[PDB]
């Protein structure tokens with residue numbers, strides 16, 4: 307039934323641990339790959355650089371503050387209404403009404419106004435010139451376009467009425483926490499999909515997602531926008547051994563790391579000395595080789611040198627238990643017993659991991675047992691990726707697993723996120739010199755000479771590394787399980803989308 311019924315209907319159903327969330331692409335809770343299926347930006351950012359999309363040609367003034375966009379005249383939203391310069395203006399205006407939500411993306415701080423020149427010409431006026439503007443208008447959020455007809459009283463910051471975009475699929479039926487359909491858009495202006503329907507199906511990871519893939523109740527799987535893979539290696543081995551599934555892994559795209567909350571004045575992780583101690587207690591070589599079964603390489607710094615503007619080797623603290631012990635002694639956390647104490651309190655920490663990531667869970671369990679030998683009670687907590695993200699915002703954590711944001715985002719956007727409420731500001735909020743460091747991040751984004759810019763990033767990361775906020779563990783990639791007879795599965799530069807409209811023969 308399952309796998310052939312879905313080939314006959316030209317259908318993917320993919321397994322995921324979480325629902326698609328709030329499909330308003332002007333905010334950030336909704337699934338990134340889902341939103342990349344229905345919404346589109348003016349321009350896209352390929353490996354060849356900027357390529358036209360909803361804007362076909364565009365002009366740039368000499369002073370660099372005015373961008374003129376000539377728009378396709380053959381684009382309609384999923385509700386019928388036309389995409390035109392007016393539509394572009396209302397969208398960008400609605401986003402800038404809520405620009406506090408977006409300050410991690412510098413372009414939102416410089417957008418002065420949007421002006422309609424005529425039916426299909428729209429003019430973007432900035433307050434300074436800024437060459438990443440094209441790059442940031444190509445991001446999947448927030449500068450993508452929703453049918454103005456769905457605006458709430460001309461606004462999007464407080465939600466939308468329907469979720470109508472210009473993409474190759476349209477949102478169909480969606481059962482909260484159960485499923486969401488992505489029906490082929492027959493009116494799509496560009497490369498029309500060959501699949502009739504991609505459906506998200508929500509279910510726990512582990513055996514229950516493996517079995518559903520084996521029956522063909524789902525036939526597809528990819529690591530989600532929080533880096534969670536619903537199928538571990540052995541499940542991939544068995545799914546390959548059916549002769550029914552293929553598996554593709556992308557180039558490395560990110561660094562997975564432990565995030566340490568310098569702001570949690572509650573806990574010893576607000577003490578720099580302790581942060582430097584535990585940064586010596588993470589045996590990344592053995593994690594990458596035994597815990598992750600060789601599927602990821604160890605990461606020694608936060609951004610690998612294949613990353614733009616990273617031109618330095620800056621290896622972080624190595625696994626060294628003797629250094630760890632002396633730093634904890636220096637901080638007042640002595641061994642009484644093997645447990646470590648200070649002012650009549652045992653050294654405890656609360657660590658958080660995605661309960662849907664089997665690899666985060668096993669890493670959390672390995673670290674718990676390692677930390678016990680040091681005298682630290684590591685209390686580990688398995689939660690949804692969405693609860694992890696909110697702790698990341700509220701700061702209510704001591705340690706958590708996370709990862710960098712990938713090839714389109716590292717290092718510049720991730721580093722900006724060091725000071726963003728919806729980024730990693732909670733974790734850096736306890737650094738004494740955070741004012742200087744935060745101002746360096748704003749300044750580094752102004753430097754045009756690459757080497758002196760690369761040095762600005764280097765000095766920033768050097769201090770962040772010395773503060774022990776981020777313990778890099780391994781380099782993650784994008785993994786896709788797909789029917790063996792499904793063609794044209796490839797990767798973009800983003801870990802947050804897949805060319806669903808290109809895949810074929812199933």
Ligand SMILES: C[C@H](N[C@@H](CCN[C@H](Cc1c[nH]cn1)C(=O)O)C(=O)O)C(=O)O
Pocket residue numbers: 334335336338410447531532711715728729
């Ligand atoms: C704005 C900020 N970051 C970006 C880029 C990074 N996304 C990853 C993954 C993710 C999934 N859902 C939301 N963010 C992250 O925030 O860790 C975004 O979500 O569009 C955010 O999530 O609010």
Ligand SMILES: [Cl-]
Pocket residue numbers: 582623
């Ligand atoms: Cl040190």
Ligand SMILES: [Co+2]
Pocket residue numbers: 334
């Ligand atoms: Co995000």
